[PDB]
Design a protein around this ligand. Structure first.
Ligand SMILES: Cc1cc2nc3c(=O)[nH]c(=O)nc-3n(C[C@H](O)[C@H](O)[C@H](O)COP(=O)(O)OP(=O)(O)OC[C@H]3O[C@@H](n4cnc5c(N)ncnc54)[C@H](O)[C@@H]3O)c2cc1C
Ligand SMILES: CN(C)[C@@H]1C(O)=C(C(N)=O)C(=O)[C@@]2(O)C(O)=C3C(=O)c4c(O)ccc(Cl)c4[C@@](C)(O)[C@H]3C[C@@H]12
Length: 366
């Protein structure tokens, strides 16, 4: 390689891709939407499985650092009334597939690992266009740049996939509402104490509640349900409008959980989406281009596949792009994509499948 790569998106999947390339010498860049490095990343915690997510960290020398920040966490399962199954973390296993890390923390660990100015902040890729030998990358109100390989690694809603595949995202039919509570122990004591330093999942009448009670000192919860045919007709801008819907749905549940709803300051309602690995991707492409993470195989969050498969993506493509066991870039990508279409479709089938089971009328996590 006498060339350069451009990864669109500073996600955990993108930044990883960046490290694994950079430590092999390959000249690389990460164009990130976010306005600066201390931008707050909304969402839960992530857990890197020992088979996969962890392996990539290993190969970047960051596995250790990952544990250092990660927190092993037990899981309580609950009725609407009260407790059902507790499960602590047995010390034989607290260093594996469990350790829940804060999304920002992971990025901090990743940004450290990269040379300075590897990530160009406030760069919102609006358009991608292939020239003679280089792609031309267009960013909203910033100068364009060019590169010899673009790796799309920029979210399940990537607006810029066209050169790789005509496939488009699809809503699965469920919906998720997600929120944070700061100082959970004061603002939802009832709920905090039901968690008891442990994650919490409870299900009742095709309504699922999940919670982590300790995400860097804030509780993050999720509510889930098949999308109402009524929908759409809840305003995620008016908190009163969201609260009123959740209370109608959650009327049955204990006083403790209703506190949680009534306390949340603001909600983030996004539908469950899939970007299916259905057709093979375009086999004639103007220049070399590929996709990793959710830009590749966006799938329902109901299985902890997601970041893990996506990190595997980096591990594989990065190896391919460095070992010198391929004759052209085309071939190295075209090979990574074969493998991903395999464990990828697996991960998706699994997630879809878990999705179906949970919202089935009468479900218990036991
Ligand atoms: C509610 C919820 C819960 C989830 N829970 C889990 C889980 O528990 N375990 C798991 O493995 N997965 C989970 N997922 C999926 C998980 O978040 C993703 O797999 C992973 O975070 C996505 O990694 P990524 O870097 O490929 O995507 P992203 O993290 O979305 O990274 C893309 C990056 O590109 C940036 N970007 C977007 N557009 C542009 C652009 N135009 N130009 C430049 N940059 C851009 C974004 O800002 C972002 O920084 C969950 C998803 C949701 C919605
Ligand atoms: C966003 N939503 C889907 C869930 C959610 O709201 C969570 C949260 N911390 O509040 C999660 O734990 C989740 O985001 C989350 O992390 C889950 C998770 O890790 C997981 C894995 O890895 C394997 C099997 C299962 Cl059944 C799960 C499971 C159900 O615990 C999911 C739940 C989701």
């Amino acid at each position: 390689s006498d060339k350069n790569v451009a990864i669109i998106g500073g996600g955990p999947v993108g930044l990883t891709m960046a490290k694994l390339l950079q430590q092999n010498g390959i000249d690389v860049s990460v164009y990130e939407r976010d306005n600066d490095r201390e931008a707050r990343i909304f969402g839960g915690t992530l857990d890197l499985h020992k088979g996969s997510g962890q392996e990539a960290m290993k190969k970047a020398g960051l596995l250790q650092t990952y544990y250092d920040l990660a927190l092993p966490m037990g899981v309580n399962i609950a009725d609407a009334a009260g407790n059902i199954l507790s499960t602590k973390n047995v010390k034989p296993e607290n260093r594996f597939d469990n350790p829940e890390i804060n999304r920002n923390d992971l990025r901090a660990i990743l940004l450290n690992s990269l040379e300075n100015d590897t990530v160009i902040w406030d760069r919102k890729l609006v358009m991608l266009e292939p020239g003679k030998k280089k792609w031309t990358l267009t960013f909203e109100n910033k100068p364009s740049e060019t590169a010899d390989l673009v790796i799309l690694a920029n979210g399940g809603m990537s607006k810029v996939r066209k050169f790789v595949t005509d496939t488009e995202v699809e809503e699965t039919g469920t919906f998720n509402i997600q929120a944070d509570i700061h100082q959970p122990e004061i603002n939802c004591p009832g709920f905090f104490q039901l968690c008891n330093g442990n994650r919490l999942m409870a299900s009742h009448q095709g309504n699922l509640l999940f919670a982590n009670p300790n995400n860097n000192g804030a509780l993050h919860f999720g509510i889930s349900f098949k999308t109402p045919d009524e929908w759409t007709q809840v305003d995620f801008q008016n908190r009163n409008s969201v609260v009123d819907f959740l209370l109608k749905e959650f009327s049955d549940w204990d006083e403790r959980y209703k506190e949680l709803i009534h306390t949340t300051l603001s909600f983030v309602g996004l539908a469950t989406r899939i970007f299916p690995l259905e057709k093979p991707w375009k086999s004639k492409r103007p220049l070399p281009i590929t996709m990793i993470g959710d830009a590749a195989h966006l799938m329902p969050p109901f299985a902890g596949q997601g970041v893990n498969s996506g990190l595997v993506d980096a591990l594989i493509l990065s190896d391919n792009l460095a070992d010198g066991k391929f004759n052209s870039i085309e071939e190295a990508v075209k090979n990574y994509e074969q493998q991903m279409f395999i464990y990828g479709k697996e991960a998706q089938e699994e997630s879809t499948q878990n999705e179906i089971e949970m919202f089935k009328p009468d479900f218990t996590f036991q």
